[PDB]
């Protein structure tokens, strides 16, 4: 039975599935902080589902065949073009950030749906809660306009209010000079153009805004680059947390049913990511969006609702 | 003089203009419980004193 009010009445209640291990964990930190390596280690040791950080093509990976789609179906958002020309007048910098916020918002709903439906905890790398540090860094370097920041805050205000924050926030602290050294080692030509001013603004947002705010509602664990290498100690610390703050304590089966009804319907999740605020960075004219939409439906498995596409081998369509 | 001006002014333009004005009078309300229910009292009093709807 597809989940809904009837399944809820028939005993499908989140308090049955969830346990003391059903925790939502996010790992945060600056660029090249090793957060990704730790997140995979935490997830394996604790038996949690790992979500690689939501990028430009995260949504492609959850629908269709799961493979990335051509770039024009992401609006030509380019991380590489953000590093080559962060001040380009085509609006790429904020168009990318708005797309990534929607991607994280989608991933967060996917994480909650897994946690609530199955009871297994999840590990995320950054979330909708820390996404704003990149926005502040862009704004302070002059990569985006103040109108773009207002748009982001409008969207965040009416989307993040619907969700519960992570049980645990793991921050990996790496000084900017060390981050800059590590970027040179990784050998990515576009990433090498990042400035210390940009990296420093990310750090200031994390420590001035993010960590103080999450401390009031989550269990925050901070680690240096060296401490984070010992995932056994990190996992040990997570297992001995008390979990005595935050809105998760005020949750019952009724309130989690309402949450599950939301996170399962992805169009209700993304509803306000496309509010009609005409900002040049994110506004698309009818001729372009009409053209691209028609090409989208011409992709394999995209013309019809999943399960009704003959061109990818669906069968029994006349009885479905 | 006639096609682009007066034949527009005497009919479509003036009729359209009046509806717009009437619409703003109708919809320029303060959203106050006090005033709306005060208008109810006037309606009831008018219905009896002026139009004698109670008879």
């Amino acid at each position: 039975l597809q989940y809904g009010p009837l399944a809820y009445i028939l005993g499908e209640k989140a308090t049955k599935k969830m346990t003391e291990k059903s925790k939502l964990i996010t790992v945060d930190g600056n660029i090249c902080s090793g957060k990704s390596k730790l997140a995979k280690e935490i997830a394996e040791k604790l038996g949690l589902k790992h979500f690689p950080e939501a990028g430009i093509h995260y949504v492609d990976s959850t629908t269709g065949d799961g493979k990335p789609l051509p770039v024009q179906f992401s609006g030509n958002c380019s991380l590489e073009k953000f590093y080559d020309d962060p001040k380009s007048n085509d609006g790429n910098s904020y168009r990318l950030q708005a797309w990534l916020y929607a991607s994280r918002l989608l991933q967060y709903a996917d994480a909650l749906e897994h946690l609530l439906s199955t009871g297994q905890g999840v590990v995320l790398e950054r979330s909708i809660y820390s996404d704003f540090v990149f926005l502040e860094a862009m704004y302070r370097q002059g990569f985006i306009r103040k109108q773009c920041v207002d748009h982001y805050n409008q969207v965040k205000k009416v989307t993040i209010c619907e969700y519960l924050p992570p049980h645990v926030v793991v921050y990996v602290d790496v000084p900017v000079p060390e981050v800059q050294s590590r970027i040179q080692k990784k050998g990515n030509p576009h990433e090498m153009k990042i400035t210390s001013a940009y990296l420093q603004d990310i750090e200031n947002a994390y420590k001035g805004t993010f960590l103080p705010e999450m401390s009031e509602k989550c269990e925050v664990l901070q680690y240096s680059a060296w401490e984070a290498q010992d995932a056994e100690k990190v996992v040990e610390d997570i297992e001995y947390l008390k979990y005595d703050k935050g809105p998760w304590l005020d949750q019952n089966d009724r309130k989690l049913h309402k949450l599950r009804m939301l996170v399962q319907d992805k169009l209700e999740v993304l509803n306000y990511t496309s509010i009609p605020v005409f900002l040049p960075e994110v506004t698309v004219g009818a001729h372009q969006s009409d053209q691209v939409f028609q090409e989208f439906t011409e992709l394999p498995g995209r013309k019809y609702r999943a399960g009704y596409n003959e061109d990818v081998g669906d069968k029994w369509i006349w009885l479905k | 003089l006639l096609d682009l001006i007066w034949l527009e002014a005497i009919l479509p333009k003036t009729i359209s203009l009046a509806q717009m004005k009437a619409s703003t009078l109708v919809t320029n309300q303060k959203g106050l419980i006090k005033l709306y229910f005060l208008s109810f009292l006037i309606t009831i009093l008018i219905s009896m004193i002026l139009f004698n709807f109670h008879e």
């Binding site: 409008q154 306000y272 009609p276 | -």
Partner: protein, 70 residues
């Protein structure tokens, strides 16, 4: 030429509080996207009670500054 379709300038005509702005509706603004207005008015529910003993026969010299929630 290509068929004209509304641009941002045309579309913004339908994004105001009202269709026909007047001086009496200038202060009107569109409502929140999700119908939720911020709770900023009054939320101060924690009593602070300077607590002593009902009868001073035994304790007498106890002052308890307690903060209550119901």
């Amino acid at each position: 030429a290509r068929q004209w379709q509304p641009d941002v300038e045309w579309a913004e005509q339908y994004g105001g509080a009202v269709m026909y702005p007047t001086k009496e509706t200038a202060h009107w603004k569109p409502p929140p996207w999700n119908d939720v207005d911020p709770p900023k008015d009054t939320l101060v529910s924690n009593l602070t009670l300077n607590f002593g003993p009902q009868h001073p026969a035994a304790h007498g010299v106890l002052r308890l500054v307690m903060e209550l929630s119901g």
